[PDB]
Amino acid sequence: ANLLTSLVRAHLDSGPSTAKLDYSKFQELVLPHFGKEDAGDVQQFYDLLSGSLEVIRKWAEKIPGFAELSPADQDLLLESAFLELFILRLAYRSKPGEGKLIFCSGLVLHRLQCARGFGDWIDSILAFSRSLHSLLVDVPAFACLSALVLITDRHGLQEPRRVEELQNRIASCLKEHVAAVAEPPALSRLLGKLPELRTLCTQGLQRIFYLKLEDLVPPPPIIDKIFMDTLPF
Amino acid sequence: ANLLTSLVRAHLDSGPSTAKLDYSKFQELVLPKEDAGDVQQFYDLLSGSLEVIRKWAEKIPGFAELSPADQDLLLESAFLELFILRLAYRSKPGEGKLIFCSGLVLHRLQCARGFGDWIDSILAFSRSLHSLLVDVPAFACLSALVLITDRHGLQEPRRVEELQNRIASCLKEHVAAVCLSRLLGKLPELRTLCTQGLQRIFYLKLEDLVPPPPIIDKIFMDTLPF
């Protein structure tokens, strides 16, 4: 499809090539003081989140039809889907067999270098990365799934039906692609992994809550807004 | 002191007698994350501690002669940390058994489900508190010190600090009559344990199997610096 193509091109452009990975701050072994953190750790955590949102916005806008939605709908879909998108894209990108996390800037950091600011969450993201990698999801299938995480029913949408339409389009796209490779829903093996992902979004929220308590440095406003908006109370 | 006496009397009156401990629901054994009944029990147990602590606080000399707002503030800010400290002092971590202020006795596994990790950390603190072997008068002073302390928003911060000083003198003289800061060193880690409490409630509030009781929920929100 020209849709699939658009989706894949959008995806690849939203992340680094093996060519341009950034190992400058990579350290194969760091010795941290666990269960505890300084302001630099927390800043880096927030910076990394912030960087993903900016990248994800730009990625979202290259999804056909996404850019035509109500501006409020655009923001809503992006806020509701951000953590889950951050985790999924990071898990798909990273190499858990080397304990290394790869961010969308190309930045490469090791489990131990993130342990301070992310806490346990980073270990659990890595566990998910393993389990994701074991179902072997090709880039076009991923380019569809990521879009599907974003483009989905959320409470408060102004034009729920346009969103559902755009959902339907992307789901067909995925279906045809899956048939092109191997005539099917299948998929259920992958959805079996989706509880792990929900849980990981919760951990994310819990971590931010905790850092917000501690307040060594305050969250960036956009991240803080998402934190608050996505709380069902 | 008549102060110390007042503090000790207040403390002892605020919990169960070995006589009236309630082992009815105690179970040594069980198995095997949590359901609504676990969460309800957690909130019930917190709720049960509330009114006991207000009544205890009012028997502290001078406490009752603070601004009503200051009274409520000091109580809301100190509730979790008081619940934890009194529970840790009261419980027997060697036997894995938690004793609540109703006299209810439960085993660490019987409330692991609803407290999560926090219960282990409370029990860890209980061990550590006990190793210091803190006698009842010293405890009666410490608990008061957790309550009567600087909080953001106090109307009469200095009266509170004066009352602090009084109680700290009381404690110091008592320890000498019989560490001087080994027990005071405990309070920092109690704050940390409060944090876990908050984190747990946040988590339960996310999953929402049952909502918090209003009074507990109010404390949760009011004690958030944002």
Ligand SMILES: CCCCCCCCC(=O)c1cc(O)c(O)c(O)c1
């Ligand atoms: C690998 C673990 C699962 C990750 C991929 C699943 C994507 C999320 C998903 O299917 C999904 C589920 C919905 O109910 C929905 O309305 C949507 O737009 C997408």
